[PDB]
Amino acid sequence: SPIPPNQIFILSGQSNMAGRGGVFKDHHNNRWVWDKILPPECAPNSSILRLSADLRWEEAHEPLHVDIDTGKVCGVGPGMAFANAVKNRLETDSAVIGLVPCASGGTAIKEWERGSHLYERMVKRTEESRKCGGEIKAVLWYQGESDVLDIHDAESYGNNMDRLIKNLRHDLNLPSLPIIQVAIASGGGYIDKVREAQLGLKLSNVVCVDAKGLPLKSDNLHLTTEAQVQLGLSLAQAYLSNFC
């Protein structure tokens, strides 16, 4: 029975938030499997919890999205590295971190409009996470690889992201809720238009960390586990420096 969290972070977006670090296709049988390699930056802690799909707080372990990004084999994302870094820098025995995984692989931002299944799941899980009395401290968002494939999607990305942030702040009644988004590292196509939108968005209490240059898996699309540690540390640095 974990002690409930008091500092809650919502993790959302597509598969580089859901986590694919360490997921490899078994050469013997073609099954995708997480290699279970866990950097010490991602180590579990009784003061770092995860909201399960069945809405129970449990001690957090990678992969954080197993019961959330269903139908996809999950690996390491940036969440545990983020959480350990924040917990350690806070240096406060009382701080208990709660992570609310909401990401869904293969999703373009149109699938996150207000009213959509994924958006409503994110809002519902965020509301459920507050019942323990904990405060929502930030939303970490890493998405956009699915928006590079069609120029209409890439050219609308900044407007769609502005609307998503406005929607979340409204529906959660948190007008200043910090959002930390990630300029995508990969995807091909109109990646530069999507990155320009992410890096160029200027909104109160929204910051963008850049994943460009982080190591990619053999598919040239997903971050490796060591990249995810780097990204989680960068997301923690942005959270700590801007919002604490």
Swiss-Prot record:
<feature type="active site">
    <location>
        <position position="219"/>
    </location>
</feature>
<comment type="similarity">
    <text>Belongs to the carbohydrate esterase 6 family.</text>
</comment>
<feature type="active site">
    <location>
        <position position="15"/>
    </location>
</feature>
<dbReference type="InterPro" id="IPR005181">
    <property type="entry name" value="SASA"/>
</dbReference>
<dbReference type="InterPro" id="IPR052940">
    <property type="entry name" value="Carb_Esterase_6"/>
</dbReference>
<dbReference type="InterPro" id="IPR036514">
    <property type="entry name" value="SGNH_hydro_sf"/>
</dbReference>
<keyword id="KW-0378">Hydrolase</keyword>
<dbReference type="GO" id="GO:0016787">
    <property type="term" value="F:hydrolase activity"/>
</dbReference>
<protein>
    <recommendedName>
        <fullName>Probable carbohydrate esterase At4g34215</fullName>
        <ecNumber>3.1.-.-</ecNumber>
    </recommendedName>
</protein>
<dbReference type="GO" id="GO:0005829">
    <property type="term" value="C:cytosol"/>
</dbReference>
<feature type="active site">
    <location>
        <position position="222"/>
    </location>
</feature>
<dbReference type="Pfam" id="PF03629">
    <property type="entry name" value="SASA"/>
</dbReference>
